[PDB]
Amino acid sequence: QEELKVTFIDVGQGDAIYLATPAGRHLLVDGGGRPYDQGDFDVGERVVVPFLHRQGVRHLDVVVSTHPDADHIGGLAAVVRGMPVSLVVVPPLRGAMLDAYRPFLAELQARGIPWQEAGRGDALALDPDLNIQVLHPGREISGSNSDSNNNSLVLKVIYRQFSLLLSADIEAEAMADLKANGADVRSTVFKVPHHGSRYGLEREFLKQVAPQVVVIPVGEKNNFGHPAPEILSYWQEMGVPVYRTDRQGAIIIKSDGERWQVNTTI
């Protein structure tokens, strides 16, 4: 019954979220995403794996690759090459999406690392005190299975009264679907999708999340103007503090399931 500790690693314009669970399990959600820095600097080798060593991690129980487009795998390649990984979770892979993932999945097979496709209604049993629910995407052969950002994996991490919604890169169309299907998205902490892009502004969905604080992993002087002013304005309208990795470095959230705290690096 150690506290849950979640670190949003400062990986620039990218997401990498390390969760140390109460029982002592190690979970990594993403590893920096698509290299907009042309990949010459591998954020996985240079930032993520060294971070995990500095936190004392020697193996990861679960690695989650949230995005169905394989050129978003990014630093996760370096993670599975740089330390033992017991399980990789990916979204439902279909069509050309599976195609592009095939080299990564072949490396997993060569390493003996099982992978699991996860979709709406699944859960990642890892720690008996943590409920890790997969809310999105569904598995239906539906319209635009190929709609990449909107079919990224959404996870809700629950420890008693504390919850964290890891929204990956979803946009307003996915948010409307989640709202329409009654997804239980109300959360203590909301990870804003796709670095605060304005295309994640779905007010009915965000009203239901009703977060106490939000976290934006986002890079300084990224090419997209992230986080969008419309997104920052929205959280101001709601009175919700915004934590950002570009301005504040790594963001650390700790909780015993009743009390929780957010701290920053810079």
Numbering used by the authors: 532 to 797
Sentences from the paper on this structure:
All competent bacteria require ComEC to transport the transforming DNA across the cytoplasmic membrane. Most ComEC orthologues are comprised of three domains: an OB fold encoded near the N-terminus, a central competence domain consisting of a bundle of transmembrane helices forming a channel and a C-terminal β-lactamase-like domain. In the next step, a single strand of the tDNA is translocated across the cytoplasmic membrane, which is mediated by the putative channel protein ComEC, while the non-translocating strand is degraded. The β-lactamase-like domain of ComEC is a member of the metallo-β-lactamase (MBL) superfamily.
We determined the 1.8 Å crystal structure of BLACTMg, consisting of the characteristic αβ/βα fold that defines the MBL superfamily. The active site is positioned at one end of a wide shallow groove between the sandwiched central β-sheets. Our structure contains clear density for a phosphate ion in the active site, but lacks coordinated metal ions and thus represents an inactive state. While our structure of BLACTMg does not contain the β-CASP domain, it does display common sequence motifs found in other MBL enzymes, such as the characteristic H-X-H-X-D-H motif (where X is any residue), which consists of H598-X-D600-X-D602-H603 in BLACTMg. BLACTMg contains no bound Mn2+ without specific supplementation of the metal (as captured by our crystal structure), whereas the majority of the molecules in our sample are coordinated with two Mn2+ ions when BLACTMg was incubated with 5 mM MnCl2. The absence of coordinated Mn2+ ions prevents the active site from adopting a fully catalytically competent conformation. Based on the catalytic mechanisms of those family members and structural predictions of BLACTMg coordinated by Mn2+ ions and bound to adenosine monophosphate, we propose that D602, H603, and D600 rotate into the catalytic centre to coordinate metal ions. Taken together, BLACTMg coordinates two Mn2+ in its catalytic centre in order to function as a DNA nuclease. Mutation of most residues involved in metal coordination render BLACTMg virtually inactive in our nuclease activity assay, with the only exception being D600A that showed a ∼5 fold reduction in the apparent initial rate compared to WT. In summary, in vitro the BLACTMg functions as a 5′-to-3′ exonuclease and an endonuclease.
